[PDB]
Design a protein around this ligand. Structure first.
Ligand SMILES: Nc1ncnc2c1ncn2[C@@H]1O[C@H](COP(=O)(O)OP(=O)(O)O)[C@@H](O)[C@H]1O
Ligand SMILES: [Zn+2]
Length: 69
């Protein structure tokens, strides 16, 4: 099944690129209808970048969740 190719790519994508900032925690994400949105930062570093006023790492990549459009 072609959806399983997409699910294990996403599974991988998420497990091998950790938080841009701390580079150990993995990334915050959320599901938005057909897409998985992977934020660049883990939650803790994200909240901290608001406190310290850095917004250099702010951002996300969306990924279509399914093999077919
Ligand atoms: N954990 C995080 N790491 C990096 N950037 C983030 C994180 N959470 C939110 N952001 C950024 O802050 C803004 C708010 O995003 P989000 O709540 O996904 O937008 P929307 O509310 O329109 O869905 C976006 O630029 C998003 O990329
Ligand atoms: Zn982090």
């Amino acid at each position: 099944d072609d959806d399983d190719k997409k699910t294990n790519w996403l599974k991988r994508i998420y497990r091998v690129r950790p938080c841009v900032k701390c580079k150990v925690a993995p990334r915050d994400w959320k599901v938005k209808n057909k897409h998985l949105r992977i934020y660049n930062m883990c939650k803790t570093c994200f909240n901290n970048s608001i406190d310290i006023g850095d917004d250099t790492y702010h951002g996300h990549v969306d990924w279509l969740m399914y093999a077919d459009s």
